[PDB]
Amino acid sequence: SRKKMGLLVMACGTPYKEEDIERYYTHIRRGRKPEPEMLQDLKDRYEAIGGISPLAQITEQQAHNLEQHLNEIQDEITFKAYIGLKHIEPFIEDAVAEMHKDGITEAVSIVLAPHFSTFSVQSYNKRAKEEAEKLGGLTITSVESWYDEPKFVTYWVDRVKETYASMPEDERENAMLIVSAHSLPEKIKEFGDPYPDQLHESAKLIAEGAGVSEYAVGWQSEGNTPDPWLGPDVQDLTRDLFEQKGYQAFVYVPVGFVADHLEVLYDNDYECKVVTDDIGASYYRPEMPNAKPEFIDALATVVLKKLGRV
Ligand SMILES: *Cc1c(C)c(=O)n2c(=O)c(C)c(C)n12
Numbered sequence: 001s002r003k004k005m006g007l008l009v010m011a012c013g014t015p016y017k018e019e020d021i022e023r024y025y026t027h028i029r030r031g032r033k034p035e036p037e038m039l040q041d042l043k044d045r046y047e048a049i050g051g052i053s054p055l056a057q058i059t060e061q062q063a064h065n066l067e068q069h070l071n072e073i074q075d076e077i078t079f080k081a082y083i084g085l086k087h088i089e090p091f092i093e094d095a096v097a098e099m100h101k102d103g104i105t106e107a108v109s110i111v112l113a114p115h116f117s118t119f120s121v122q123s124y125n126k127r128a129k130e131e132a133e134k135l136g137g138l139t140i141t142s143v144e145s146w147y148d149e150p151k152f153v154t155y156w157v158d159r160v161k162e163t164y165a166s167m168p169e170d171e172r173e174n175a176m177l178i179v180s181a182h183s184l185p186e187k188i189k190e191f192g193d194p195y196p197d198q199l200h201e202s203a204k205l206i207a208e209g210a211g212v213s214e215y216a217v218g219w220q221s222e223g224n225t226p227d228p229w230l231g232p233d234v235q236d237l238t239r240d241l242f243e244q245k246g247y248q249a250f251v252y253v254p255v256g257f258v259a260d261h262l263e264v265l266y267d268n269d270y271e272c273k274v275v276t277d278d279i280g281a282s283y284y285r286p287e288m289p290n291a292k293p294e295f296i297d298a299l300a301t302v303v304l305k306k307l308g309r310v
Pocket residue numbers: 012013028257260261262263264
């Protein structure tokens with residue numbers, strides 16, 4: 001009959017309620033509890049973007065919809081989704097342990113971040129595989145990147161085309177597309193990490209499919225460590241390009257992110273919008289994929305291609 005396979009869907013995680021902010025950020029900060037002013041700031045930011053709990057639901061919806069779509073579009077494998085998160089329960093290791101307890105012996109994994117990096121994707125995949133090895137009798141084949149899946153490129157291409165079509169003529173003629181992902185420490189370059197190259201390729205593919213000749217690649221959401229992070233940051237890039245050529249509209253495609261979270265709804269829709277409001281340009285940031293059918297179909301195609309079934 002149908003072969004059973006685990007579908008390990010991995011992501012960063014989000015707090016589930018305001019009282020989870022402390023523990024989630026302590027985890028991201030490697031055990032350093034945020035000071036009270038930062039905790040208050042973070043709560044205010046989540047309030048300003050409409051609340052925490054919707055953000056927390058998106059990953060679950062993505063995993064659910066992906067499982068059901070994969071099971072509909074082919075007839076050989078029955079997938080069961082398990083969510084494994086980096087910074088809050090259910091953790092990657094919990095998910096693998098659950099797959100093992102449930103009798104899964106073969107799984108495929110995907111990280112809900114389309115570009116490979118050594119800091120994120122490789123670390124999630126290594127955590128999942130090490131837990132599988134420790135438990136024994138369960139193997140995981142892991143997607144490493146998927147930014148170049150044509151269906152995923154097309155998601156963003158069509159959103160960009162719609163945004164440009166929506167602009168008044170003077171904006172459309174004097175607009176800049178900024179394509180971004182989460183910054184990482186610059187030291188990843190010592191490993192030959194392809195993350196920057198893959199962001200630039202994402203940007204090339206999206207601008208090309210959308211027919212957008214003027215675009216730039218930037219990074220966002222860098223951390224505070226003395227070591228440099230990848231730049232330029234989108235806020236500085238926006239101002240710099242404005243000072244160079246006077247763009248009247250900036251379109252932000254944070255292609256490294258697949259769902260609403262603070263690092264889009266705040267780091268673009270507030271922090272970049274501050275800059276565009278200051279320089280008098282219009283701000284546009286098309287919808288994140290979230291759990292939209294077009295994006296789920298792209299992910300399902302990524303998974304089936306990884307398994308050689310397409
Ligand atoms: C840790 C964290 C925060 C605060 C945020 O907004 N996001 C994302 O969008 C990702 C992918 C991660 C991780 N985080």
